[PDB]
Structure formats: C-alpha cells, structure tokens
Amino acid sequence: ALRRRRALFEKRKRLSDYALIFGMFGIVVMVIETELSWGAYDKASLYSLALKCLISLSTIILLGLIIVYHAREIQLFMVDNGADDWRIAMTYERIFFICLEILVCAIHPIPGNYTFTWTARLAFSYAPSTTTADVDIILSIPMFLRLYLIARVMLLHSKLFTNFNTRFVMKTLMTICPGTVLLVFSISLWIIAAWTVRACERYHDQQDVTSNFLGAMWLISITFLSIGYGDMVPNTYCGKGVCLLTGIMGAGCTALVVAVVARKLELTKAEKHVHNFMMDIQYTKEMKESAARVLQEAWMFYKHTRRKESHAARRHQRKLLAAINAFRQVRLKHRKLREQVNS
Amino acid sequence: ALRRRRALFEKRKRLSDYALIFGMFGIVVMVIETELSWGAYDKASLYSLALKCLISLSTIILLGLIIVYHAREIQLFMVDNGADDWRIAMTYERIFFICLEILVCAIHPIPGNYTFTWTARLAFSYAPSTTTADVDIILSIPMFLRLYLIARVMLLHSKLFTNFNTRFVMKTLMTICPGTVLLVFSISLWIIAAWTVRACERYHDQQDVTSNFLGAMWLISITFLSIGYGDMVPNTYCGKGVCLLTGIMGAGCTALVVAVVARKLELTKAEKHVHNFMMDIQYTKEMKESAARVLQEAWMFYKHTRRKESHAARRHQRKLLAAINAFRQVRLKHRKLREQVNS
Amino acid sequence: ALRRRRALFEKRKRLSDYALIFGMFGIVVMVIETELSWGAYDKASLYSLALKCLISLSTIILLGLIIVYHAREIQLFMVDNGADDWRIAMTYERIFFICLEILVCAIHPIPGNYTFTWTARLAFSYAPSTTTADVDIILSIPMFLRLYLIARVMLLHSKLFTNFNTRFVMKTLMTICPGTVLLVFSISLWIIAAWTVRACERYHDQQDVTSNFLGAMWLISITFLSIGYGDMVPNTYCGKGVCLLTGIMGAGCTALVVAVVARKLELTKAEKHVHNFMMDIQYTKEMKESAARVLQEAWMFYKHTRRKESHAARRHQRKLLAAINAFRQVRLKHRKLREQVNS
Amino acid sequence: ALRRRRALFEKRKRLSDYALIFGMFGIVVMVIETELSWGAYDKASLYSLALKCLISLSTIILLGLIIVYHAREIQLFMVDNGADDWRIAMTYERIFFICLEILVCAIHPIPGNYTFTWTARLAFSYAPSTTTADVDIILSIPMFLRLYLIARVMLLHSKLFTNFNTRFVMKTLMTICPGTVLLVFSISLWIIAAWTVRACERYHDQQDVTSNFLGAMWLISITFLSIGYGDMVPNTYCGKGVCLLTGIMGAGCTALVVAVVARKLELTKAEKHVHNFMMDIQYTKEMKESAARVLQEAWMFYKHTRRKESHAARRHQRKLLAAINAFRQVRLKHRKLREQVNS
Amino acid sequence: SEEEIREAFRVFDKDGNGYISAAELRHVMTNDEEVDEMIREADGQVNYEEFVQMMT
Amino acid sequence: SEEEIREAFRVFDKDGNGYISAAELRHVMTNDEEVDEMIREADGQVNYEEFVQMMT
Amino acid sequence: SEEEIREAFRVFDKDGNGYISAAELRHVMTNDEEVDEMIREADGQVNYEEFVQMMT
Amino acid sequence: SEEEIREAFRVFDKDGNGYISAAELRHVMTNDEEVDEMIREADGQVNYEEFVQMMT
Ligand SMILES: [Ca+2]
Ligand SMILES: [Ca+2]
Ligand SMILES: [Ca+2]
Ligand SMILES: [Ca+2]
Ligand SMILES: [K+]
Ligand SMILES: [K+]
C-alpha cells in the first residue's frame, strides 16, 4: 500500500543516483581520453583501447540502470492506478521517451581505430583544409547530453519537491534563487561549450587561435553576450554550431535577467514604508528651509527698498522669486508623498 | 438574409483556400526552377521555358481567384449594409488594397531569357565583380510576399475567430500560445531568408562562403540574434538587404520574448498558495532548529563558564551570538511570509 | 491682462515658426552646398561663395529671431510674475540657455576657402592617409543641432499642450502614439546619421566602401540594431563618433520598445471579457467530448472483458485511463477559468 | 553608552575618509608613473624609484588605516553586543574579509626594476610577438580595486543612511536617482577600462590601433553596448579580459535600463487624471464633429435623391456610411475613457 | 442606421429637450441658403420624426 | 476512477434530474446496434448505479 | 505671492496659535542685529498682517 | 538577548502551558548524560525563570 509506494520511491531515488555517477564517469573518461589522444599517444595505442573500454563498460552499466529505473517507474504506475498488466502502462509516449534515453546514453566512442576525412574551409581566409580526423570526436560531443540526469537527480532529491511537473519546479527555482540558477547554468555552459569548440576545432586550426582553451572561452563568452566574433570565427561546422547554440542560450539568459532584475528592483511593502518614512523626514526639513529662505529674501527685498538703491532690491527680488518657486516645488513633492502613504 | 450571409462566408472561405494552394504552388515551382537553372540546365533550355510557364499559369489563375474573392467581399459588404450599387462599396481605400494584392501576386519570373549586368564589390576585399545575371532572380524574391495568404487562411479558418481585426487576433495568439507563434515564424523566416541570401549571392560568390545553403543559415541566424557578421558579410545589396531585414525582425522577436518570459515567470493564484505552503513548512522547521541551537549554545556557554576555562566559554559565546542572529533572521523571513499569506 | 498674455503667446508661436523655416533652410543649403562642393565645382568657385552666403544670410536672420523670441519670453515672464525690470528675469540659468542657443545656431560654414590637414588611419589596414580637407565639413555637422527648433514648434503648436514640461509632453506622446514617435525619430536619425558618416568619410575612403550613401545607410542600420560592423568600419573619428552615437540611441530605442511592446500585449478589461467568453465556449465543448470518450472507453472495456480476450480489453483499459487523465486536465483548466472570471 | 557609540561612529566615519584620500592618491601616482614610464624616462631612472616610493608610502599608511578602521568596527561590535573579549568578535567571516581588504590594498608596483617576458599573438594576423614588459603593469591594474572605498565612504556619509545592508542602499538609490547611478558608473567604468586596455596593450601594438587612448575609448564603448569589435580586437589577454568584463557590465547595465525606462513611462495617479481630462476634451469635440458630418451627409444624400441624378446620391451615400463608421469608432473610444475614469 | 441617426440627433440636442432648434442647426454647420432650405424641407421646429424622415 | 466516472455521468446528465435518457445516450455518440446493446446490457432508463456497474 | 507668504508663515508657526514668536524668528535663521531690527520694523509679537506688511 | 531567549523558550513550549517538559528537552536535542545534567542544574520541571537563570 502506502509503505510499498514509498519503497518504490526509495528505489527510484537510488537508481538515479548511480545513473548519475556512471553518467559523469563516462563523460570524465571521455574528456581525459580525448585530451590525451591528441599529444600523449595515438588512437591505435593500447592506452586508447583501454580508456575507450572504460567508457563502453560504463555505458553498458548505465543502460541497465536506465532500464531498471524505468521498470521501477512502471511499478509505481501499476500501484498508483491499481493495474497489473505491463501493457496497461506501455503507452506510445512512454516507449518513445524510454527509447530516447537509451539512444542518448548509448552514444560513446566505440573502441577501435576508425577515421573519416574531414574537410572545412578556414575562416577569414576561405582556404580549404583537409585532415583525417578520428570518428570518436563526433561521438564524444553527444556524450554531454547525459547531463539530463542531473535534473532528474535534483527533482528526485529536492526537499521541497518531496502538478509537480518540470514547469513548476523550474518556475519556483527562479523565485527562491534566481541568481544561482542563472549562474550555475551560465558557468557550466561556459566550460562545456568552450571545450566542445576546442575539441572540434583542434584539427583545422594550426595557428592556435581557437584551439587554445583560453581563447575558446573568450569566443564562447563574447558570443553568449552577443557582442560579436572578432577574429574568433570557427573554421568547422561543429565549432559554428556550438557558437550558434551558445548564442541562442545567450538571448534567453539575457531575457530572464531583464525579467528578474525588474522584480528585484521593486520595493516590498516593508521597504516602501521605510522608504516613505526617510523621504518624509527629508521633505519636512526641506519645507522648513525653503520657507525660511522665502521670509529671509522677502524681508531683504524690503530692507533694500528703503535704502534708495536700485541694483540692491533687484537682486533680492530675483532671489525671492526663485525661493518662492523652490518652496512651491517641495510642497508638491511633499503632498504627493502623503498621498502615496495614505493609500 | 442570415442564410445568404453565411453562404457568402462559405464561398469566401473556399476561395482563400484555393488562392493559398496556387500561392504556394507558384513559390514551389519558382524554388525548383531557380535551383535547377543554375547547374541542371541553362535559362534558354526548354525545361526553363516549361517551368516558367507553370508559374505564369498559376499566377493567372491566382489573380482571377483574388478578384473573385474580393468580389465576394463586395457582396458581403452589400448584404451587411443593405446596399445594391457597386460604387457604394468601391471606396478609395479598398481600391488601393485590391490593387496592392494584384501587384504583389502578379510578380513572377516571366518566360523568356532576359539578362542584366549585375555589379557589386566583394566584402572584406572591396574588389569589384561583374556578372551577367538573369532577370528572373529579382522577380523571384518578391514572390515570397504571397505568404500573406497564410494569414488570411488562418483568420478565415480559425474556430475561435468564427472588433475582430488583425490586432486582436495577433494579440490573443500571443496569450493562448506565445511559444508556437514565436517558433513557427522564427523557423519559417530562417529558411526563407537563408535561401534568399543564397539565391541572390550565388553569382558574386566563387569561394563558396555564403552561396552554401548551410553557410547562409548560419549568417541569417547570427544576424537574427544580433551577434554579428564574422566573415559572412554579403557581397551584393540583395544579401545585405535581407540580412538587415532579418536584423530588424531579430530585434522585435527578442523584444516579444522579454515581454513573454516576464509574464511566464510570475506565479498564478493557485501556484502562489502552493508556494506559500511549502515555504511555510520549511520556515516552521527552520525556526525549530534555529531556536534549538540557541538553547544548546546558551547552556554550553554556562557549562564552560563554571569549568574555570577561558578559551572554552569564549568559543561558545561567539557561537551563541551567531545562533541568535540566525534565529532573528528566520523569524523575520517567517513573519514576512505570514503577511503575504494573509493579504 | 489675459488678452495681453494671449497676445504674447501668439507672437511667441509665430516667431518659432519662422525660426524653424530658416533653421531648415540653413541646413538644406548646407546639404546642397556640401554635395556640390565635391564634384560639381571646387571650394574657391563663385558658386561656393554664393551658396555659403545664403547660409550666412539665413544664420544672421535666425539669430535675430532667437533673440526676439527670448525677448517675448521675457515679456511673458514679466506679465506672469507682475515684474517690470529686465534684471528680475535675467537669471543665471536663462542667460546660459540663451547663449547656448546662439552658439548652436551660429555654427555654419563661413564663406571663404579655408583648409586643414586631416590625418586618419584606415580601418582593417592600419595604413595612414593624409588629405587636405576643407574646414567647412567640421562646421556643417554641428548644423544638425538646429533640429531642436522642431521640438519647440511641436510643443508650441500642439492642441493638447495649449507641470507642462518636456518630461510630461514626451511621456504622454509615448502613450497616445508610441509607434509614430519611435518610427519618425528612427527614420530621421537614419538619414541624418548616414549622410553625416558619408560626408565625414568621403575624404579618406577611395574604395567606395562607406562613402557610398547606400552603404552608409547599411552601416548606420546595423550599428543601430547593435548587430555589428562587418567590413563597414569607419576610417575617421567623425565616422566613428557618429556610429557610436547611433549605437547609444540604438540601445535606448530598443529599451523603449521592450517597455512598449510589453504594455501593448496585455489585454484590456473589454478584451479580457471577450477572451474569457470564447475560452469558456471552447472548454465547455471540450468537457463534453472528453467525458464522452470516458464513457465510450469505459464501456468498450466492459464489452471486450466478456469477450474472453486478453489483448482486447488491455488496449481499451489503456485508452480509458488516458481519457480519464485528459478529462481531469480539462476540468482543471475550466475551473481556473471560472475563478478568473468571477474575480 | 549611547554617547560612546556615537563617538565610535565618528571615528569610523573619519578613518574611511582618510583611507579614501590615500586610496585615490595611490591610484593617481600609479597612473602618472605608468604614463611617464613609457616615454618620459625608463624603469631604472631615479624618478621611477621616487614615484614608486610614494605608492609604497601611501600603501603602508593605507594598510594601517584599514586595520585601525576594522579595530573601530570591533569596538562597535563590543558595545552593541555588550562583549569585552576580542575573540568574541573575531569570527571566521570577519577574518576573511579583513584579510581580503589587506590583500586588495597591498597590491602596488614594488620599487625596483623587474621584468618578465610577455608573449601574445596579434589579432587578425595571428602573428606571435614577444616583448620584455615590466612587472609593474600586472600590479598596477589590480590597484583599481581600491575603488570599493568609495562605496564605503558613500554609505558612511549618506544623510538618509545615517536592515541597512548594501542591498537596500543600492535598491533605494535606483529609485531616488536611477539616472545618476547608471551614468556615473557608466562614465567611470568608461575611463577606467579604456586606460586599462591601453596600458596593457601598449607593448604589443606598434600600429597605434588600440594603444591610442581615444581608440581604446571607442573599443570599450562598442563592447559595452554589445555592438561588436570591428577592427579593435585586443592582442593581449589583459585587453581581452577587460573587454569581456565591460561586456558583462554592458549586459547588466542594459538590463537595468529596460527595468528603469519601464517604470519611468507609466503615468502616476496625478498624471493619469490630467491625461484623462485632456483626452475627454478632445473626444467630446470629436463626437460633436463626427455626428455633424453624419447629419450633413445624411441630408446631402436626400438632396441629391430628389435631383433625379444617379452618380450624385451614390457619392453622398458612400460618404454617409464612412461618417457613420467614424461616428461609431469615436463613441467606443469615448465610452472606454469614461470606464477608466470611473474606476 | 436608425440607431446611429438617433445618437447623432441626441448629440445635437444639447439642451436635452428633444427638440433641436434652428440656432443649433446653424451652429452645427460651422465645424446660408442650404440650411434654410433643409429647415423648410424638414419641417416651427424639427423633431426626431422629421429627422428620420429627412434621413430616409 | 469512481469520482471521474461520476463527473462524466453528471456531465452527460444535462437536465439535472439524475437519470440519463436514451436520447442523450444516442446524442453523446455523435461527437446503432452498439448503443442499443449497451442500453440493454446496462438496464427503462439508466441511473448512476447502472453506470458504475457497467464501468466496473 | 500672498498665498506663498501665508504658507511660509504657517510653516514657521509650529505651535499653531497664529502668532509667531521672537524665539521662532531667531530659530528659523540658524538654518543678531538684523533679526532685532526686522522685529522692530515689523511690530510685542508679529501676526499675519504684520507679515504681509513687511513682505509688501 | 533576553527577548531572544524568551522567544526560543516559547518556541520550545509547543503545548502553550508555559512549562517545558523533560520529554520536550529530550526531543529538541535530536535535531543522554548531558541532558540529564542540564535538567538537574536548571531545576520537577523547568520554567522561564530557570531558563533565564541557566542562560545567564
Ligand atoms: Ca433646440
Ligand atoms: Ca435523461
Ligand atoms: Ca509664536
Ligand atoms: Ca512541557
Ligand atoms: K546585441
Ligand atoms: K553584436
């Protein structure tokens, strides 16, 4: 009953934990293998076969974990709706999603040396360049799609979480902490996209322009902020696609900021009362000094009128009218403040 | 009467359907003819004459459909206002609009080989280039203006539709589905503008920079997001005009997003009540543990005071004050929550 | 009294009309003289002396009109505040503003041939270039500052206008017609800035890159939308300053649009009632068909249960549960609609 | 008691004043020394030793002022919480912040000639360049971090200031004066970043492209507005880092503007009443003339009907219907206005 | 059309008495023989029935 | 499931009498032998108890 | 100007009695011979009529 | 500090009787000898006066 349903929640919570451990382990070994395959050794070395076998070993384990995890999800569906037969839960939508996760998680560098001819025209020079690139680079980039397991772990481990769909979870995360969400994602995308641009463009860049990791972080950062490209224009279409992908995320992350820095500038009910109080004190003092200048200039006008001077009273009259105007301005500003405070 | 008026609605609904079929048929044959006229054969081939005759045959049929459609609109005006004479409905505004649709829909590649000298200076090199380009390319681009028949079909076939002007229809479409409108239009503009840039710039690009369709989609995409041009600067003024047109649409479509992602982040009345409940549970637990630390540190201060030690009670006093501060902070956060819930 | 004050309003209204006529006349003759001084003739020709004498003749007349206009403003100040002496109105602020208008309106190409050595390094090549440019080009550009008389005429001739400062007038113009203000200014800045870039950069551009007027309109347009520069990078610092000035106006005019397209997407009270009605009709029909499918699938489940088949009832049970879910979703959507309508 | 606490406020207010005087004095001498060290003399000259000794003398004095200032903050903590022992106030957080200020304020060009090999590849050319740059340039740039003393002085000297954290102080400064904050910071960042780009890139720029101060202000300005780079792409990674830093501040300062120009366009309660009144007067007159045209055209229709003419009455009937439509439109616009005024 | 004509007639009738006066007819034209002719052909005063008779 | 079936039955019962009629059963299918068969197997009228008996 | 002078006089009159005191005159100047001279030329106390007489 | 200690004591006192029980003392520690020792040193029950005596 309820105890059984809670048990299924625990197993479903545990499986997503291990699927994340093997999810990041497969990516980490891919990153180490890709970095070392360039200069440390060659694609046919025994080290390359060994490291590409750890990724395969982690992928087989991960795929079993995804199947078992969805099997637990089937059991939770059976308990919730009081059904027994498997087919009552194997809807068309669920089959597509199960197959999608398997396809995404089964893409990894297969052991064995396989190469393909890569041809791309250089940027700013339009000069063709042909190199025999390994096939493991077009399979390593999709491995970053395994990061969806981080979202699954987050939802299944959130205290507040446990309709409760991803829409409500993301929306409430943009209210409790709108800065952490827009900073962790921005920094994580920065490193992931910069390494992807460098990895795809280390074959067709011999001048160390974008192949440099520190130069690739600059290219991703200017593109994300939509500043421009400068001279960091990618040569390959993998580096162009990632720059475009960062540009799109750079126009949605600069649209959430405008919609978050607008709510964060408005004053709350408590802050408005404090703000009204301090302004009222300032305007009360201002009305005192503005009127004091009015009397001082008004009498100073009279004093020089009886002095039989012309230029004397003229200056005081000009100052008196200016003091009158400033006196009227502060009165209107004060009166508007009382109107807001009352309402 | 009412039955007659409904009949005019049906005929007006049917004519716009066929005008869209011939509207897209003329464009499709234009796209096929333009693509094949480059490498498959030449402008003087019998295939070019035949395909350019299907466009002319579709344009003559379409223009008759537009005249008949507006004739039905005249009859609907006669029934609605109870008038008989034609001239009572032939206002100056309607004549201009009828003529505008005819002029837009009558622009198509005329059969027969006609050429003009096209001269443009290359980008990033400022080197002039002259080629004898066919005249059908400056007539094929305006054919994309026939897409206004899609809007007419949408309005005349919308269940919710049937003042009901295009302003209200577009505004209500940005509320029911603000993502589909901003995605179908963005993708449709992507393919249309990218092909237009490639078609206009296949004469004055011999390095396969922007003439490549996949390279033209990148140029349109970076310009739409206002990232920059990089090395994809068009040589001709047709490719420069389309890039500018995409830039303008790229500053209005990134201004609707800011005004849509701002309404989509606010919490509804139902969501606010749920959000308040979960926060209240969290703060109730937080107040329990914060005060528990207060008592624990307060007594731990006393325990080491009687121990005749100096460094012992000092640490506990520092921790007690920090616990007091955190206890006060959670109380203020809780009290603010109750204020919002009550109101 | 009141009749006298109205008379001062009429004279003040008439003088600003003539000051605008001579304001645009001075600019127009400057534009014609600048265009013709390049190729039609030389700076020492008698035509250049004659045309530069019309600008001087219009400037002397204009400066007398500005002095007389401010003299009328003095009289209006005397009547309003009941003062007689001039000095009572000659405040420090007014003297600075009167002098500012005289200085702005007295800058025009002085008759006579005067030249200065202009040196600037080319863009994208960093190659220095030296030319003996006429001094009338650095005096023609400030002549566009006379456009402030258009604002003065607009305020003094607005029916709604006649505190009423420029802040309220501009703010109310962004509500009555936010599109016309953002379109007339955008187009007017487009032509003015494009001609200024071409005029300043016709000396140091021998490849017809930015000196072309149609190429200068593209440079101003991409900079205004903050897309980028491409290959249209100005060589001189006058063309760089104008591009920067257009960039700043291109970040404030794309910030007013976000704040205008956000108010123009919200539904009014009348539109909300209509929108609620049409949605309610749609949801009423949806609840009918969703429940009808519920009954149909529920009985279809029973019919195949008595048929002694296994795969038969399984499919109907799966469809029944999906129909139940969709039935629940439409009920929640309908119930939320009634909540909004009631409030 | 209270008098003692006020005394600690005065000493804390005075120390931050002197720490700002020496804070800007250290920066000013650094700027003068850096500018003169390039062409006026060399790094080993006695003038360089003397000027680099004024910075060291100002840094030692400043560090003593920061220690004493925080010592006063300790005493204020002792009085506020009624504690005596130092350790009760030496929390881990305070130690980190005290050490952070010391580390930031102790970075300055050490006297003595020290050089390091600086290597960077040129922009747009990818040609490596190696120069023996002085080590004082990588220590002069961090000296601009001493500007945090300006914020401390502002808070400690604000009349309104004297929870009152930096969040509330900054938020209330964006309401009282949102333009001054966004203009002083923008201009101050403009000069600081432009000089930093020029200073870091005067070694690896021999064509006077970005080393020119006026050319560096243009690069910072276009990057801040996210327009692009053009040909002003920095060669070194110090000039690239500052351009990136200005880009980030250029996407947050163009997000505050959108959230400030949106609050500054809404009409206040007083302005709405005035706006409603002037619109009502306009619509009252419009309803008079629209109906007057209705009667005039309606009777003009009758007059020509009895004239036995065909084309005569047809024109008047068409004008009458147009007048009827315009009469209905103004009635709806007027009625909507009354609805808003009542509510 | 009848409702719009009635609304226009009510707009003209500022005094609210239901009878439009010849002075009002002369006034609403400033926004000589024709007005007198229409007064004669519509009639010592004009009411709503005469207004709709002239409109039709 | 019982609550959802009850809600659907109430939606069908437009007249609010609590008894769904054969005419309503025929009508709710347009959005011949099968409807008559289900009427026979659910039964001179159908109530909520028969509805939940047929649903189960 | 009369309304503004009256408003300033009311602002000075904090006690609300309608008669401004010499102590208040001395106080409103801190935001010796001149104040005594103006007190003498405006007069044992100063009222609104004396205020508008001195203002004019 | 006294107000904060009083607030914490009230938070502990869930039953609202003003007397905190040893069971509550044991419970508020799970978020053996030490609790018994502090109970003995604070005392058959603990009140607000004992709470502020132990706090001070
Ligand atoms: Ca009358
Ligand atoms: Ca029934
Ligand atoms: Ca008094
Ligand atoms: Ca108890
Ligand atoms: K941009
Ligand atoms: K850009």
Residue numbers in the entry:
A (entry chain A), B (entry chain D), C (entry chain C), D (entry chain B): 120 to 281, 295 to 475
E (entry chain F), F (entry chain G), G (entry chain E), H (entry chain H): 82 to 112, 119 to 130, 135 to 147
What does the paper say about this structure?
In the structure, there is clear density for the S1–S6 regions, but as observed in the closed conformation of SK4, the CaM density is weak and the N-lobes of CaM are dissociated from the S45A helices. The structures of SK2–4/CaM in the Ca2+-bound and Ca2+-free conformations confirm that the chimeric channel is gated by Ca2+ and that the mechanism of channel gating is similar to that of SK4. In the structures of SK2–4/CaM in both the Ca2+-bound and Ca2+-free conformations, Tyr361, located in the center of the selectivity filter, is rotated approximately 180° when compared with the homologous Tyr253 in SK4 (Lee and MacKinnon, 2018). Focused 3D classification of the S3–S4 linker was unsuccessful in identifying particle subsets with a dilated extracellular constriction, suggesting that either none or a very small percentage of Ca2+-bound SK2–4 is in a conductive state.
Small-conductance calcium-activated potassium (KCa2.x, or SK1, 2, and 3) channels are activated by increased intracellular Ca2+ to induce potassium efflux and regulate membrane potential.
